[PDB]
Amino acid sequence: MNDAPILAKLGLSKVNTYYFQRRKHIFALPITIPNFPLAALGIFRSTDMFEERTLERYSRDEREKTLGKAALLLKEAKEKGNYSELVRLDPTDPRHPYYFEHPWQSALKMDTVSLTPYQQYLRWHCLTYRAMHEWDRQGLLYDDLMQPKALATDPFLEEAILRLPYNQRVERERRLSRAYDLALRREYLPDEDCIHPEDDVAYLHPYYHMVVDEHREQHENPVDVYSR
Amino acid sequence: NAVGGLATSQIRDLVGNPAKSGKPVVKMPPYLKPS
């Protein structure tokens, strides 16, 4: 990870949070249909390790990490006086407190000495499972496939898109239209234009996470118990 | 060189060629550098 050295000095782990993922519950509630009855309970689960895992953002550890990085930025601003600059970094900057990295952005240059055999399997799986879907041959980034729906829309997602800078929004739309045109013929880009895994940047996950936190803010500081 | 007492060419070079202000340059995020 490009963020790792910072995480190194805050006493955190240099390894992606994609590892350490674990099952803590038996039943998955609230039960959601249209799963089949037994599957609706969630006793037996099928995962490909590429789920969003958004609800795990409601943790004290993640907040501590975010505030540690923010405190580093504020300390630098106090020393130098470039506060403005340091609070307007692009969320793809490793110093931004909400920096997020896909597991494959560092799977090729990972330490791999501290990984459990299960975690080594996870690394190999991340690379190969990315290769299988062939969104890298469509000239597309993974976050381009995070799109909202007409009904049951993902609210955060919509906001996450409106926070993008104008040029990045336009580039996202243009990539999506090119992928649409390619998909008409089920065509791929020339083999030299394949997306390298380290180029598959997660440019929308920081905005997504910031929106999630801002939406939970008012819940934890209620005006009153029976308040909208 | 002087057309009727005027160094018109000189005047032209000083008056007839204003600079043209183009579109503002957009700084490219490092993750968009790949073509």
Binding site: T92, P94, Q105, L108, K109, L127, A131, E198, D199 | -
Partner: peptide, 20 residues
């Protein structure tokens, strides 16, 4: 494709797409 902490872009490691 993201910059390092210093702000400079490093060279991508060699990569062969996984086979069938």
């Amino acid at each position: 494709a993201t910059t390092a902490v210093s702000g400079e872009l490093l060279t991508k490691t060699p990569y062969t797409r996984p086979g069938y």
